[PDB]
Structure formats: structure tokens, C-alpha cells
Amino acid sequence: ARPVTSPGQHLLAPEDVVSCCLDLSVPSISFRINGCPVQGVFESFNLDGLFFPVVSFSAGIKVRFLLGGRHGEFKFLPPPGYAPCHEAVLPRERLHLQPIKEYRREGPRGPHLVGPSRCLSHLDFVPCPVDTIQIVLPPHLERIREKLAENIHELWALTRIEQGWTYGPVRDDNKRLHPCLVNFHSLPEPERNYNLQMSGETLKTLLALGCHVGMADEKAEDNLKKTKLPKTYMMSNGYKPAPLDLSHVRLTPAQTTLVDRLAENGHNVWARDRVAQGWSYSAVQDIPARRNPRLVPYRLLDEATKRSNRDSLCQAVRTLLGYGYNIEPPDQEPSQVDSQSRGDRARIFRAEKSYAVQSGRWYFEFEAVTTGEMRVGWARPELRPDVELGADDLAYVFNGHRGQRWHLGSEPFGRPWQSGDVVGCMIDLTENTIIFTLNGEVLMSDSGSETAFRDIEIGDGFLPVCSLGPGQVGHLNLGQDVSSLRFFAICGLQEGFEPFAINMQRPVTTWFSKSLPQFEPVPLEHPHYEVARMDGTVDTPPCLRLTHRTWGSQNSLVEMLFLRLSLPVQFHQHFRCTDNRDDPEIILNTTTYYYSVRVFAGQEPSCVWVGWVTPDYHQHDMSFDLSKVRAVTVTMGDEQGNVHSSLKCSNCYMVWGGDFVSPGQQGRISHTDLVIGCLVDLATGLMTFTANGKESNTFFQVEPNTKLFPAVFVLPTHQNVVQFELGKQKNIMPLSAAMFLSERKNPAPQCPPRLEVQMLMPVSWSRMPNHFLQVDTRRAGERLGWAVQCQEPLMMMALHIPEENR
Amino acid sequence: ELLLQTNLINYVTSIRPNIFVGRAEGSTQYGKWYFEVMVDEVAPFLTA
Amino acid sequence: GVQVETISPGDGRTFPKRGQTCVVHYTGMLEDGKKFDSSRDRNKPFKFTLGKQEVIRGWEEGVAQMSVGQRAKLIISSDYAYGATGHPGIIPPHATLVFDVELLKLE
Amino acid sequence: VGEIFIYWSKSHNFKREEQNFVVQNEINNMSFLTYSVQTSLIVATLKKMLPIGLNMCAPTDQDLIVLAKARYALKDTDEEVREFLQNNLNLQGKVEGSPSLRWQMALYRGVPGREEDADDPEKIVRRVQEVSAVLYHLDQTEHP
Ligand SMILES: Nc1ncnc2c1ncn2[C@@H]1O[C@H](COP(=O)(O)OP(=O)(O)OP(=O)(O)O)[C@@H](O)[C@H]1O
């Protein structure tokens, strides 16, 4: 929190109006309080995503979002050039207030568990039509091309009069009369040129698609019977639309699919052209301002516009098909999206470990509100959060999307579920069996067995578990209210199964797999990574060396690895105002500390980043590079500008190993280790780096009280990857002296047991709260805006780990 | 700094409208956006 | 010395005078942001008479600089709060204290 | 169905004839369900109808069911088992004894009609006897 000056400063209080302005061009974020400027700005921040307005609060608040238009009238005029936020609502959405990244919701019969939500990306608004300029129309195609440009206008005009449109000498919205309504030659040549270029473009588009068109009969193409025009149909100008008429032509599912692809490319080409001309999207059309309600990539368009475009294109596809030219939808090439990592994508909810059952007959229910990827069953207490449910021996589950039983792999079982279906899960620890029912009917394997699994070793017991994929919703009923169970009586009660939470006076606590990367000690038995603690010799300091166990061999795992040291160095509360043997006074009075990383020969320096991270680094980026580091500048100025301070904030201070590769050695595997040394002055906030002795040009400045962990990000390319060297330099203290109070004046390098290497893990188990804030969101009116209310207080007892600031 | 620390803290939640704006080369989205929030009631110390 | 930064405005006229009993609700933190005291945790306003040297010097000056109903942040240096000795087991030696005080009433 | 299954278990010619017929005609019991005692239609139908029988008995009668199975294992006749149930109809499971019976009885009384029944001791001595006999013979059939 950085104090910011404004007239009559005060913590947000009733009748306060906060205006927020975001200029993505700078980029910059600025505020106004009750119309007065706030003398501070955020700027130069990351732009790799989409921004949304947000309010955060605790209980005891009531606020209203004003977004302009009919969604809250502004109390102050937006600064010149800024657009009301209500205009940014996408075509196929309706404006409303929503929570962010919710894993749980309320529902008619109880709490609903929610899987991850699929989000758009800033690149989803870039139209990307296929190249269609290198394409050269076949001669036969070019002959139909001229007809396509004008005939398409013909069908349009027939539709336009059907719209009630009549030619307008002057366009008028009340008139519904179009100046551009007339004959293709009558229509202005520049507008006509866009039409003619479009008809040729469709043929080139097909060639790019790869569908092949050649005319089986030229005579059939010659035979045309364009529909006549009624007099009411004719425009004020008197021009009559004469689309050529072709009742005979028919489509095929592949051909219809190919027409949907054709409509996408056309719209994307148009969108790219309009963007180049300088248009943008807006929920409310504004022709003078060059804002269009349809200027989005075809994928995000509303269904009505999609249907209209598909109709036009399918009419045009048919005219070519009827001429005799053969359209053959291009072969389909197998494609995989893999939007995210499956091992870390689906959200897993399990009961708390203390509820594990080691005997008896237990039953619970899972209602599938959606019908997508969802798994439900029983898991062992040591279930891992980064593995798909049932992909290993730690869970026996049923996947009702297609019908499968998962345990150490997938096997066909049961039938797919439908929305509202209830899956009953039974475990019988006397017979050592697991049974699944769907709406009370026991699901059976192909062999006809009525037990999904059998001969199950009890071990440490079992817990109810479920897994929800992106965009999925389930309802887990453990049976505290036996009356709430919907099919327990039908199947399970007589067979002798008890609801899981039958005699629990409190609801069963659940944990979920949280996808927030966290640093954890490298496991002692990690199959791929091994850390060795090397003692300091007469010429070598203490070291922590990383080796890739399974390098080269098959099944080797090669991915970005984010490592840090378990303990931080802390900068002083107050910064200082403005032989080769150590000199005792200098070394006892220095505030500069040092540590190095040795990158072994064979490890590519271009695949290594060395430096520091703050306690809040959480990026498990598999394509990491320094441009992805979070950064933002906070600039505080005076009441007439006059910048007074400009602080850069980040969570990763590193140098790239590639900056120290000589251009000559570049492109050749080096035979020398690269040692990168990091120096921090804890009393001034300065951080500098050296590469093989030479001082580099990279330097950073941090603020007092900052906590920094030594860090290394590496993509292994060798069996010996890197080595943390906890040594010293001349007149510079080792890291142990900064980390440990008792060693504050000890210049001998040390590596105590607490200091160890930690790696970034993508998923962790997290306890879901038993109660949640009750937030009421509604629309107060067309002038008041969108109201958010939260009145009932809620508190938790937090446990804080000091060194990790978590 | 050595023992684990404890304290009672408030639960906090966030609310947004479904409005998403960004920038990319060749994007169809406008660049400058504006909105407001009016505070009707605020209890400074509903809890400790 | 003590620096006073308003958080919420007060009445603007009624200030404590020597010999008066100020009633306050406060939360104390160390400069690094660690909480060590709060009257709201005990749910009982803290009362102290101005000029009787009952509280630290930083408090004596800062609260006197406030008006009734006002909430303010007080930043107090070590020499004004506890100096070198500190508060054994609570406040380290040579610690700057940040307080979030609210002057509820005067009596 | 339970009476037919009891006859099947008691007699030995019945089992031989069933096994023969199935083997000779190559009748796939799995075809109907979706050669062996498990596959026997006679026992499969009984096991599929059994829930309707267990539904007749209130949970309070589970103790009498165990007792009746215990005599029938002593090889007593139906009139005998009925008499013992009639006499020591006071060995019924008590509700306050264990919470499980509490929620079981909650469900049972919630089901309409079931609350109205179980009020005449003849009903109990009949239903317990029947269900206990069926469960006994099921136990023997499944057991080696
Ligand atoms: N959103 C769009 N997607 C694809 N093609 C388009 C789109 N808008 C315009 N076109 C092309 O421009 C032609 C415009 O000709 P037409 O006379 O039918 O429209 P208009 O009345 O001039 O309207 P507009 O103002 O939308 O250009 C369309 O036939 C089509 O070729």
C-alpha cells in the first residue's frame, strides 16, 4: 500500500464516488475521488491478458457499479476518449455481476461444486483469416467469379426489400432506405469493388481450405433461371434484385461444415479490414466513432449473425455446386487443443483425511448438473492433487461423460449420464467391492458384473472424491440429511449401506486441489531430480547441486524447472542515506552479500535464469522468459503533475544466461562452466550481477524490508544442470551471514540444514471453508447501477509462516 | 520470525461485471475504458 | 517525533486539553506490519488522562493533535515510543510503532 | 418367488434338472440378466426381488430376523419359528439402544403406509418368519 494524495483524503466512506480510467495504450490506470484527481498512477504493467473492473471487500459494505448507458449513470463525465465500460459486454453475453474463480456456489438443494472456468484471452479478439492472396483462381472459377460478385448483390437486394429496404437517395434509419441499394454498376464503384473482391475471395478461400472445385458439366452452369422481381420488391431507384435461382442443389454434413468454415473466414477477413481502417467493437453502434457491434472474431459472434452469414454463404456455395463445379470438403487433419495441463486442470474435491473409512458399507450421491468431464468415487488418503483421478492406484472412480471406470487406467463401464442424473457410490469394505448406480440402477460392465471394482486392499481407508473438469458443476451429497438422498432407498438401504455422513453433527469438511503454484522442498525420492549437498572444501564453498536422474534415457522428463532456496534475505528497515585476504574492518562492517550459480558445461546457458524471487512468485510458466515477469510502476506526483516518486515493483529479479554467451561461442555447445554471481546490498537496496568475474549491465533497486529468495529457473539440457554455490567474495559476506542472526558476523560460508532447495509445484491441497460470505448482487435500476451488498461478518483464525510471508 | 503466528482476520471476496478488455496487435477492442463505483454504506469496524 | 495522518475526518473543533480523559480505540503494529496490540480485540475502549504521563510520548502528542470522532494513523519513532529498552517480549529494541487510533469521545 | 427358491434349495433333483436343462439348451442366463449357482435364474430372481421383502420388515424386527434365522438353522419348521417369534416377540430391537435404528425408523415411518402397519403381532411373526427363511437359504446357497 502506497499513500496517495488527494483533496480531503479519507478512507472510502458513504457517498463516495470512485472513477477508474484504464488507458491500455500507455498502459496506465488512474483514479478520481468525488471528481478530484488522485495524485498517483499505475503504469508500464503486463498486458498479456484481459482486464476487468473489480471491487474487493469484507462484510459490512454496500456499493454500486456505474457502467454508463442503462447500467448506472455516471456522476462525472468520462475524460475525453475513454469509453463507458458497459460497451465492452460481448455480443453473446448479458451484463451482470459475478464472482471470480469460484469453486463452489449455492443451488436449489445445497452447495454446488464448480470446476475451473474457461476464460478468453486477449488474443481471442484478433481476427486471423487464412491467407487468400497467393491463391490464383482457376479459369473456370474466374468465369463464375464475375457472376458471384453481382449475383450475390441480387439475392441481397431481394432480401433487402424483404427487409422493407427501398433505395434511398439519402440513407435514413427511419427510412430503412439504402443509398447502397441499387444495381452492382449503379452502386458506387469503391463499394462495388469490395463486393467483387469478396466474390473472388470466396473461391480463393475454398482453394486455401483445400476443397477442390472443377465443373463436371459446363452446360449445367450455362442453364440459369434467376427468380423474377415483384414491383413492391423494386427499390425507389427501381432496380430489381435478380439473384440467380437454383432449387436443385443439395448439401452434405461435410459440405455444410465446409460452408460454416467459409462464413468464418469471410467475417474474419472483413473484421481485419475494418480493424486496419481503424474500427473497434462496441455493444452500441456508433458510425461516426467507427465502433461496430459486430466487430469481433467470428467465434464470439451471436447466433443470429452467425446464422445470417452462414445462410448467405450456403446460398453461394449451392450456386457453384449447381453450376456443376464439384465441391469436396477438404480432408480433416487431426487436431488437439490441449488448452491447459490435464494433470493440473480438473479440480478435485475430496473429504478430509480424518474421515477415511476402514470398514463397513458406505454410500453417497453425486448429481451431475452438467454432462461433461466429471469423475466420482473413492480415493485413498494419500491422493495426489496433480494426477488425474483414477490414473494411478490411489482412486477408484466412475466417469459418466462416456461411461468408464478409472483405476490405473480406463475401461468401458456403465452408460453416459445426463443433466440431473444422480450417481450413487457404494463401498463395501467387508466384500472389498465398489458399486455404482445411476438413478438407482446398478451400472454393469460389459461382462455383466455388477461390481465396478473388487479385491480392493483396505489399506488406510477411503474417502469420497470427485473431479470436475473445466465448466462442470456437480452436487455432492454425503447423506447428513438422509431425507435429502434421492435414490438411497431405491438401492442401498436394503442392501445395508449407511450414508457416509449419517451421524455427523456437522457437515463433512472438504479439501480441493488448488492450482496456485507453490514452492515445496524437492522430494527425496523424486524420479527425475536429485539435489546433493556438497561440503565446502579447501578451495570450494558449500554447494547444492542439481542433477537430472533420468536424462537421455527414455521416459525422461524435460520441462522448465523453477527452484529457490528455502530461506530469504531481508533488506534493512532503513536504507543508508544517499594477498586477496579480507580486511577485517571492511568485512565486519559490510552490508553486501553474495552467492553464485554454476551452470555446468553442457547445460545451455540460454536455458538458465539466475537471480531472486519475492515471496509472491507463483508462475509455473512452461515457456518462461524474462518478458513474462510481473512488473508495474507506481508514480506519485504533485497536484500540478511534477512527478515526486516512481517505484518499480516486481516479484522476479533475474538475469538471462544467454546475455553472457559470447557471439562466437553462440551456436556451439561450450566446454566451460558459467558462473553467475549475485550481489545484494541490504542497506541500500541495490542488486547487481557478474558473469565469470566481469560485472554485467543488469541492476535492480528494491525497497526496504523486501524479502528475496535466491532462485534459478532452468530448462535442463544435461545430466548436471546447475549448482547453488553459497560462497563469498573479497570483502563481501556469504548468504549465511544475512540469513541467520547468530552468523551475522561470521564470514565463514555455511549451509545449515534449514537451507535447502525447493521447487515450484503447480497444485496443492487446500481446505475449503465451512462457511462463505453471503454476497447479494442485483440491478438497482437503469440509473442506480448494479448493487453489491455484504452484511454478515465472517472471520477465520489465520496461521502465518513468517519467513514465507504467507 | 521463528514461531508460527496467529490472528483473527476477515474473509474478503471480489465481485466483477463480465467486462473484459485488453490489447493485442490487430485486436478489435478499444483501448480506453472508464467506470465508477458509488459507496452507499460502509461499517468501518463491523468486526475487530 | 510522531507523525499524524488522517484516515477519517473528525468534528474538527473539539481537541483534547490537558487533564481530560480521552477514550480511544486503537490497533498497534510494528513498522514491518506485525500487529502487537489492539483494544478492539478486548472489545473495550482504552481510556487515558492527557498530561499524566500514563502513555508513551508519541501517543501523548498524537492523540492531542486529533479531534473528537477522528481516526488517524500515528507513526512514532523509537525515542518517542520505547527507545532502546523496548517492551521485553512484546516490542523489540529501537522499534518504530504504527498505530491506528480513533478518538471516540472526550471525558 | 421365495417359496420357489426355498423348494429349489431343499430339493436336489430340482438343482440337477435346472443345471441339466441350462447346459443342454445352451441358455445364456447372462443374456437375460444383462451353468453355475450364481447364474441360476431361480436364485437371481429371488435376489432381485429380495429388496421388496426386506422392505416389509421394519428395522426393529432385525433382531427377530436374526433369531428366526438362528432357529431355522436349528432346522425347525415354519409353525415352530412362528411360535417362537410369537412368544418372545419382546426381543425386538429397541430404538434408544443404537442411533442407527433411529434414522432407519425415521425413513421407515416417513414411507407412507409402513407407519400404519407393524401394529399387529401376527404381521410381525409372519413377515419375520418368511424373510428369515429366505435369507437363511440364501446364506446357505451362497456359502460353499
Ligand atoms: N459483416 C460482414 N461480413 C461479411 N461481409 C460483409 C459484412 N458487412 C458487409 N459485407 C459485405 O459487404 C456487402 C455490402 O453490400 P450490401 O448492399 O448488401 O450492404 P449495405 O446495405 O451497403 O450495408 P453495410 O453498411 O453493412 O455495408 C455485403 O454483401 C458483403 O459482401
Q: Decide if C20 contacts C50 (C-beta within 8 A).
A: yes
Q: From CA A255, how far away is CA A205, in angstroms rounded?
A: 14
**Strand residue runs (E) in A325-381:** 347-351, 361-368, 374-379
Q: From CA A361, how far away is CA A495, in angstroms rounded?
A: 9
Q: From CA A736, how far away is CA A177, in angstroms rounded?
A: 82
Q: From CA A5, how far away is CA A10, in angstroms rounded?
A: 10
Please count the CA atoms within 13 angstroms of the CA of A91 that sit on its side-chain side.
19
Q: From CA A573, how far away is CA C70, in angstroms rounded?
A: 29
Q: From CA C66, how far away is CA C72, in angstroms rounded?
A: 8
For A767, the enclosing helix (H) or strand (E) is: strand A764-767
Phi, psi (5° rounding) for residue A216?
-65, -45
Cβ count near A784 (within 10 Å): 16
Three-class secondary structure assignment of A715-726:
CCCCCEEEEEEC
Q: From CA A640, how far away is CA A731, in angstroms rounded?
A: 47
For A433, the enclosing helix (H) or strand (E) is: strand A433-438
Distance (Å) of CA B1 to CA A63, A683, A756, C88? 38, 20, 18, 16
Closest C-alpha among D124, D134, D137 to residue D88? D124
Q: Decide if C34 contacts C106 (C-beta within 8 A).
A: no
For D83, the enclosing helix (H) or strand (E) is: helix D78-87
Burial class (CB in 10 A: 0-12, 13-18, 19+), A393: exposed
Tell me the shortest Cα–Cα distance from D106 to chain A, in angstroms: 9
Kindly state the DSSP code that residue A655 receives in the 8-state scheme: E
Please count the CA atoms within 13 angstroms of the CA of A197 that sit on its side-chain side.
12
Q: Which of residues 89-148 of A touch B (CB under 8 A)?
A: 89-90, 93, 95-100, 120, 122-123, 125-127
Cβ count near A753 (within 10 Å): 7
Classify strands A16-23 and B32-42 as parallel, antiparallel or unpaired: antiparallel
Residue A610 grid cell: 539466475
Q: From CA D123, how far away is CA D126, in angstroms rounded?
A: 5
SS3 call for A674:
strand
Q: Decide if A326 contacts A214 (C-beta within 8 A).
A: yes
Q: Decide if C6 contacts C103 (C-beta within 8 A).
A: no
Q: Which residues fall within 8 angstroms of residue A183, CB to CB, at 6 or more apart?
A: A153, A237, A239
SS3 call for C48:
strand
Residue A490 grid cell: 431405491
Please name the residue ranges forming H helices in chain C.
39-42, 57-64, 78-81
What subunits touch chain C, counting only 3 or more CB pairs under 8 A?
A, B
Per the document, the length of chain D is 144
Q: From CA A160, how far away is CA A152, in angstroms rounded?
A: 12
Classify strands A686-691 and A674-681 as parallel, antiparallel or unpaired: antiparallel
Q: Which residues fall within 8 angstroms of residue C38, CB to CB, at 6 or more apart?
A: B48, C26, C27, C28
Rg over CA atoms, chain C: 13
Q: Is A306 in the pocket of ligand 1 (CB under 6 A)?
A: no
Rg over CA atoms, chain D: 18
Of C8, C35, C43, which has the smallest distance from its Cβ to B7's Cβ?
C35
Q: Decide if A726 contacts A518 (C-beta within 8 A).
A: no
Q: Decide if A386 contacts A361 (C-beta within 8 A).
A: no
Q: Decide if D40 contacts D29 (C-beta within 8 A).
A: yes
Residue A231 grid cell: 414491383
Q: Which residues fall within 8 angstroms of residue A370, CB to CB, at 6 or more apart?
A: A419, A471, A472, A473, A474
SS3 call for A667:
coil
Amino acid occupying residue A472: Q
Closest C-alpha among A213, A330, A201, A317 to residue A266? A201
Please count the CA atoms within 13 angstroms of the CA of D35 that sit on its side-chain side.
8
Handedness of CA B13, B18, B23, B25 (dihedral sign): positive
Q: What is the resolution of this structure in A?
A: 2.6
Q: Decide if A600 contacts A725 (C-beta within 8 A).
A: no
Closest C-alpha among B36, C19, D122, C41 to residue A795? C41
Distance A180 CA to ligand 1 centre (A): 10
Closest C-alpha among A295, A134, A154, A140 to residue A201? A134
Which protein residue has the closest C-alpha to ligand 1 atom 13? A195
Q: From CA D86, how far away is CA D79, in angstroms rounded?
A: 10
Q: From CA A272, how far away is CA A259, in angstroms rounded?
A: 20
Given CB atoms, is A577 within the 8 Å cutoff of chain C?
Answer: no
Residue C89 grid cell: 517480549
Question: What single string gives the DSSP state of each residue in A614-629?
Answer: -TT-----TT--GGGS
For A498, the enclosing helix (H) or strand (E) is: strand A498-499
Q: From CA A268, how far away is CA A271, in angstroms rounded?
A: 5
Cβ count near D36 (within 10 Å): 9
Distance (Å) of CA C44 to CA A120, B6, C26, C39? 50, 21, 10, 6
CB contact under 8 A, A448 and D50: no
SS3 call for B14:
strand
Helix D78-87 to helix D62-74 angle, to the nearest 10 degrees?
Answer: 140
Question: Which sequence positions of C are flagged as catalytic?
Answer: 26, 36-37, 56, 82, 99
Handedness of CA A461, A462, A463, A469 (dihedral sign): positive
Per the document, the length of chain A is 806
Distance (Å) of CA B28 to CA A125, A199, A271, A280, B21? 6, 24, 8, 5, 10
Distance (Å) of CA A374 to CA A104, A415, A545? 15, 13, 42
Which chain A residue has the Cα nearest residue D104? A493
Q: Which residues fall within 8 angstroms of residue A665, CB to CB, at 6 or more apart?
A: none
CB contact under 8 A, C40 and B45: yes
Q: From CA D121, how far away is CA A634, in angstroms rounded?
A: 85
Question: What single string gives the DSSP state of each residue in A366-381?
Answer: EEESS-SSEEEEEE-T
Residue A19 grid cell: 472513477
Q: Which residues fall within 8 angstroms of residue C47, CB to CB, at 6 or more apart?
A: C21, C22, C23, C24, C107
Per the document, the length of chain B is 48
**Strand residue runs (E) in A498-591:** 498-499, 510-514, 518-521, 529-534, 543-548, 561-565, 569-570
Which chain B residue has the Cα nearest residue C40? B48
The two counts, helices (H) then strands (E), for chain A are 8, 48
SS3 call for A643:
strand
Distance A296 CA to ligand 1 centre (A): 15
Q: Decide if A373 contacts A398 (C-beta within 8 A).
A: no
Dihedral, CA atoms, D35, D36, D37, D41, nearest 10 degrees?
A: -40
Peptide bond into A27 cis (omega under 30): yes
Distance (Å) of CA A80 to CA A23, A543, A639, B33, B37? 11, 59, 20, 11, 19
Rg over CA atoms, chain B: 20
Helix A303-323 to helix A253-277 angle, to the nearest 10 degrees?
Answer: 120
The two counts, helices (H) then strands (E), for chain D are 8, 0
Method of determination is: cryo-EM
Task: Give the bridge partners for B8, in sequence order.
Answer: A797
Across chain C, which distance is largest between two alpha carbons, in Å? 39
Q: From CA A225, how far away is CA A247, in angstroms rounded?
A: 10
Residue A244 grid cell: 440467380
Q: Decide if A724 contacts A710 (C-beta within 8 A).
A: yes
Q: Show which residues on chain B lie within 8 Å of chain C, measured between beta carbons.
A: 5, 7-8, 44-45, 48
Kindly state the DSSP code that residue A729 receives in the 8-state scheme: B
Q: From CA A52, how far away is CA A780, in angstroms rounded?
A: 21
Task: Give the bridge partners for A779, in sequence order.
Answer: A786
Closest C-alpha among A641, A639, A614, A618 to residue A628? A618
Burial class (CB in 10 A: 0-12, 13-18, 19+), A702: buried
Across chain A, which distance is largest between two alpha carbons, in Å? 107
Amino acid occupying residue A671: H
Q: Decide if A758 contacts A615 (C-beta within 8 A).
A: no
Cβ count near A127 (within 10 Å): 23
Task: Give the bridge partners for A688, in sequence order.
Answer: A679, A699
Q: Decide if D114 contacts D108 (C-beta within 8 A).
A: yes
Residue A100 grid cell: 471470480
SS3 call for A432:
coil
Amino acid occupying residue A428: D
Q: From CA A510, how far away is CA A508, in angstroms rounded?
A: 6
- Best mutation target, A57, A298, A742, A776, to test chain B (most B CBs within 10 A): A57
Taking 3-state DSSP, the helix, strand and coil percentages for chain B, each rounded to the nearest 5, stand at 0, 50, 50
Please name the residue ranges forming H helices in A123-252.
139-162, 189-209, 218-222
Q: Which residues of A touch D100 (CB under 8 A)?
A: 498, 502-503
Q: From CA A448, how far away is CA A412, in angstroms rounded?
A: 12
Burial class (CB in 10 A: 0-12, 13-18, 19+), A662: exposed
Q: From CA A786, how far away is CA A751, in angstroms rounded?
A: 57
Task: Give the bridge partners for A63, in sequence order.
Answer: A788, B39
Q: Decide if A209 contacts A327 (C-beta within 8 A).
A: no
CB-based contacts of A628-635 (< 8 A; 24+ apart in sequence):
A628/A46, A628/A48, A629/A654, A630/A46, A631/A44, A631/A45, A631/A46, A632/A42, A632/A43, A632/A44, A632/A45, A632/A46, A633/A42, A633/A43, A633/A44, A633/A45, A634/A2, A634/A40, A634/A41, A634/A42, A635/A40, A635/A41, A635/A43
What is the distance between the terminal CA atoms of chain A, rounded to a whole angstrom? 17
Burial class (CB in 10 A: 0-12, 13-18, 19+), A414: buried
Cβ count near A777 (within 10 Å): 16
SS3 call for A322:
helix
Q: Decide if A441 contacts A491 (C-beta within 8 A).
A: yes
Residue A649 grid cell: 515493483
Question: What single string gives the DSSP state of each residue in A212-226?
Answer: ---BS-HHHHH---P
- Best mutation target, A126, A786, A789, to test chain B (most B CBs within 10 A): A126
Q: From CA A475, how far away is CA A86, in angstroms rounded?
A: 34
Residue A531 grid cell: 539435489
For A98, the enclosing helix (H) or strand (E) is: strand A97-98
Cα A438 → chain centroid: 34
Residue A140 grid cell: 473456370
